[PDB]
Amino acid sequence: PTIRKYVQSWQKLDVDEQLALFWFIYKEMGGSTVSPAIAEGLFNQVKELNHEQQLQLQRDLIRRVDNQLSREYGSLGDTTKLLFWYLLSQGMDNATIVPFPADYKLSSESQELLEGIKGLGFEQQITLFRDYVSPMGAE
């Protein structure tokens, strides 16, 4: 559908830009099955990593790097993968994961994507995020 043009547009951004956009999408939310327990499990592991390790782990998930953790994430359902990304972002907010650069100004090319997405349907907006995270991890 149209969500394809978005996911591909999103994927055609820098790895550090993609994270930045995903992050702001999360902030704009507060101002086939899913298995939640498994998702928090992976998160717990990531929580043990230091901040650098936690950033690279996210860069790795996008770049499809072959980690021991990238493999765990790859073996998850599409719906639980998204839940896991929410746990990371929530984690950053709760000081338990690498905080976002205060000085990071978002590019205007992603400021557009942010706006276009906000105008999307709730169902679609969900499918967009779900379609974005599934093509990640290893294997």
Ligand X SMILES: CC1=C(/C=C/C(C)=C/C=C/C(C)=C/C=C/C=C(C)/C=C/C=C(C)/C=C/C2=C(C)C(=O)CCC2(C)C)C(C)(C)CCC1=O
Which residues are at the interface with ligand X (CB under 6 A)?
Answer: 16, 19-20, 22-23, 25-26, 34, 55, 58, 79, 82-83, 85-86, 88-89, 98, 100-101, 104, 126, 129
Minimum CB separation of residue 123 from ligand X in Å reads 10
Secondary structure (DSSP) of 83-109: HHHHHHHHHHHTTSS-PPPTT-PPPHH
In the bound state with ligand X, the residue whose beta carbon lies nearer, of 40 and 100, is 100
In the bound state with ligand X, the residue whose beta carbon lies nearer, of 58 and 110, is 58
Give the separation between CA 107 and CA 132, rounded to whole angstroms.
19
In the bound state with ligand X, the residue whose beta carbon lies nearer, of 7 and 126, is 126
Minimum CB separation of residue 100 from ligand X in Å reads 5
Tokens read off for 126 = 């969900």
Could you say which DSSP state residue 134 is in? T
Minimum CB separation of residue 125 from ligand X in Å reads 7
In the bound state with ligand X, the residue whose beta carbon lies nearer, of 13 and 138, is 13
Query: Which among 74, 69, 81 has a CA at the least distance from the CA of 34?
Result: 81
Q: How many CB atoms lie within 10 A of CB 109?
A: 13
